[PDB]
Amino acid sequence: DNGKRRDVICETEFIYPFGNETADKEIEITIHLKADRQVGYLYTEIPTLKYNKDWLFLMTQDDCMHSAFSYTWAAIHGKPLSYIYYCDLAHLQNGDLPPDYYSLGKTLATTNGTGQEVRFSFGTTVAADDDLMNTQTWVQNGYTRDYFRFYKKTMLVWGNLQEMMNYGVSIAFHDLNLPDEDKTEDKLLAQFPVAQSMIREKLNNRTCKMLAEPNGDKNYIKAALRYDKIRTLCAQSGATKLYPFQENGDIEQVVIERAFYDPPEGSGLTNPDMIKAAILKEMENPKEERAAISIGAHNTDTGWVNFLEWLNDTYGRDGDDSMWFTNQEEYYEYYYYRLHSKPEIKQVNTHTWKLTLNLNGEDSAPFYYPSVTVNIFGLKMGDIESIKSNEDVTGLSYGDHKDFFMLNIDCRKYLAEHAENFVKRYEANPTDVSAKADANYFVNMLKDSDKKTELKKRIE
Ligand SMILES: [Cu+2]
């Protein structure tokens, strides 16, 4: 019965198996050259930014906000949007949508430089030790007497966050659920693993390794630095301003500067207005001199949706494609790989070269974004007869970039199974155009293989 009221715990039907992610990757890529395209010398590098992007945009949305799902994630991923209301996952699953719903008609993305979509990525803080994440959702298709079920909740429900994990959204600690008088360095330290246990319980054993400092409270940074599962942090003061082409040190347990760009009081401007201005000023510098545009957000709204679309239209897929729009965790891992992994390329015979690279995360927990870009200098796409890869490589896209050759190498161990889960969701909901688009997007992440061919056939 469609029209009967139900009050449900939002749930998604699969979550990427973060707990099973392998920590160590051994990449072996074999390149076979055409007969009259024998080259003399090849050498390799991991570039400063993934996909050979020019500049970095980092976004972390604080306070575990309902709008991180209903506005930020939904706008990025081509989902139904509202101007004043707040969908939960169960509303989207059931087609119970608010009375002003609309869609942008596209996802918001860059490319990877080798012909594939890379949707914008961001992180949200999590109030994992707060029982309000267990709030129910009222679903009632066709009910128009009121729209109370679409009002803003005080925070994300777990099911919303679980689904966001399937799209690579990151997580961070923020406020912990202690009495204000108990927010001492030592007591906060003891409460971090309590919150972590709930994160792991709900997010298929993903370990959170980031703190977004709350309310300028430096006791949170002091405590987090004694909890070795936290590897990266952000704050507005007491931090390091990130210049991606200049930064040379270890950034393990480093507080990276982030700004909210609040507008002057009564000036009628919005935080997106302020960030847009800061971006324009920063782009006037050569890329090597640019800071990262490292932002925080609280509640997102229609103005934020339009700003994300502006970024897509100006510096993303529908503009000059110069931006890497990602979350701080993915960037942290990439920087770690660039610092510690050393790609090598060796000639096997006159027309065969073997590219090797080891991706090893830190000892705390498996890294969750084990993908890199490797540039090969001296090679062009037109030289290549075939490229093969070993089992640790699950996604592989490549082609010319400027006067050299780039490979985008994804080693997420369960990526093919994850793409198939999106295919199964589409097969169970074959009239959902967004479900078909998601299936095509995840299947296009996979390297050429029998399984990719199978999944492509199922989503024609
Ligand atoms: Cu906050």
TrEMBL record:
Keywords: Metal-binding, Zinc
Residues binding Cu(2+): 63, 174
UniProt: Zn(2+) binding residues: 63, 174
Molecular function terms from GO: metal ion binding
InterPro entries the record matches: Polysacc_deac_3 (IPR032762)
The name this protein goes by in its record: Phage tail component domain protein
Species name: Bacteroides ovatus (strain ATCC 8483 / DSM 1896 / JCM 5824 / BCRC 10623 / CCUG 4943 / NCTC 11153)
